[PDB]
Symmetry: D2
Subunit: 121 residues, 4 copies
């Protein structure tokens, strides 16, 4: 299992110790408060009122937690994933990333605290 | 395991199929959008800007997900709990509840979708 | 989880720290060598060649590992149980017992080493 | 998870659907009766009275269940393994094998029924 902080201003993402392998079942729980620029902060589902202006993940709101697994595209995490299996041919290191527009992370603030574990399979 | 919806206007709370027993380890993941009255909606951590005016759980924001286990007091759930063990002598049916002031649930809207499972122990 | 030894001469059984509750899934692995009297020893499945002369569990061989859950009848364990659920209305403390005829435990020898854990549910 | 039969006469071993990856925790439970030649049969710990005359696994009795993980040497399984982690650098497909001397499997009989699953990690 892995526990750690994902900074909202970390454009490259937070690498975890989790390597997702074929057949794995995982659970993620994310908590905390972060911002993509405004003084207000949002939880790991992000800001439901904000337009997508080129987010790294178009399937989650700006300010949401997302992830990549190896060479995958971004996959929404939001508050977490319960006993979750990846799509076919998706495998590798899990990197967690705050959802913002590339090149616009410098004014971000806050962080999410995230647990990831492998479940029975 | 249990999956279901917790309505923000449900003052009595949503009873689950989970009976927490001594020694159990549980994981909860909650998602979605709800309001305690305003047109805006918040995620399961609630509204970090809103003053506590008599919430059923003083350890979580207004609009957060909380729970009772048997005859316990309220316990924060927020976005979820990862491989969590209850305090001593806490046991019984898990009921999930939206955090608001007693008597003020009628103007609430939305809901959270919640998974609960028992982990290895 | 519980790990401990079950002596072949222990007529009363070895009480464990496991309380089986409704809905629980458990795994048991048993190992080792024991005898119901002869110089030879057998593993947790017991002696397949020996007639049942009034065993506490008629559904397992003499010398097998069996269990009781609360006030249940005896249930075969043998080498173990994989992600196992009890029959309806079966619940309570798990006691592990060597399968022999009542009153004939005094000449028994050896023991089994047993792990029990609760699985995801 | 995998469930299947391991024939005592199968010199090459039974390939399973389990790929052991770094960090994985696994549980195995094995049951049944098999022989390395004699009319008698033994459980998955094999025959404690039989000399090692060139067994594929010198750390288990003749007639015991053993395994290889990828290109590993043989590892005893016996009645099973509880929440088990492999030695460093051991990974790959799990193959289950009856412990006998190479070239002597033709007179073997019986089989073990085996479950393998991955546990939380
Ligand atoms: N009178 C003021 C008008 C602005 C209101 C609003 N636009 C925004 O609210 C807005 C808010 C914050 C922003 O912050 C920037 O977000 C980017 C990602 O989209 C980057 O993260 C930047 O770093 C961040 O500053 C951008 C637009 C707007 O026009 N809306 C809101 C719904 C559609 C109409
Ligand atoms: N010019 C307008 C002034 C109001 C602004 C604000 N007060 C509130 O924002 C407020 C907002 C929503 C409320 O909704 C009610 O919340 C209750 C729980 O506290 C019940 O759920 C009611 O059903 C709900 O309507 C109550 C107060 C306020 O005074 N603040 C905000 C920080 C401290 C100072
Ligand atoms: N020429 C010798 C004849 C004896 C052989 C055998 N009977 C037994 O092998 C036997 C062996 C051990 C026993 O030990 C006792 O077992 C009891 C439980 O059954 C108690 O545990 C006693 O403590 C133990 O001594 C009893 C009978 C027998 O008659 N068989 C074997 C298959 C059916 C026919
Ligand atoms: N009067 C008869 C003497 C034989 C008794 C015994 N040797 C064996 O019991 C024995 C039994 C079965 C065997 O079966 C063969 O085992 C091989 C693996 O070791 C292969 O599996 C062969 O296929 C199988 O036939 C081999 C030796 C022996 O000498 N012992 C037993 C303890 C040490 C002294
Ligand atoms: Ca930004
Ligand atoms: Ca309200
Ligand atoms: Ca006896
Ligand atoms: Ca042989």
């Amino acid at each position: 299992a892995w526990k750690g902080e994902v900074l909202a201003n970390n454009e490259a993402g937070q690498v975890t110790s989790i390597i997702y392998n074929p057949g794995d079942v995982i659970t993620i729980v994310a908590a905390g408060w972060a911002s993509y620029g405004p003084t207000q902060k949002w939880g790991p589902q992000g800001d439901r009122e904000h337009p997508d202006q080129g987010l790294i993940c178009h399937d989650a709101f700006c300010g949401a937690l997302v992830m990549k697994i190896g060479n995958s595209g971004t996959i929404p995490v939001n508050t977490g994933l319960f006993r979750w299996v990846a799509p076919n041919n998706v495998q590798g290191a899990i990197t967690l990333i705050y959802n913002d527009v590339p090149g616009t992370y410098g004014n971000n603030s806050g962080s999410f605290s995230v647990n990831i574990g492998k479940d029975q399979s």
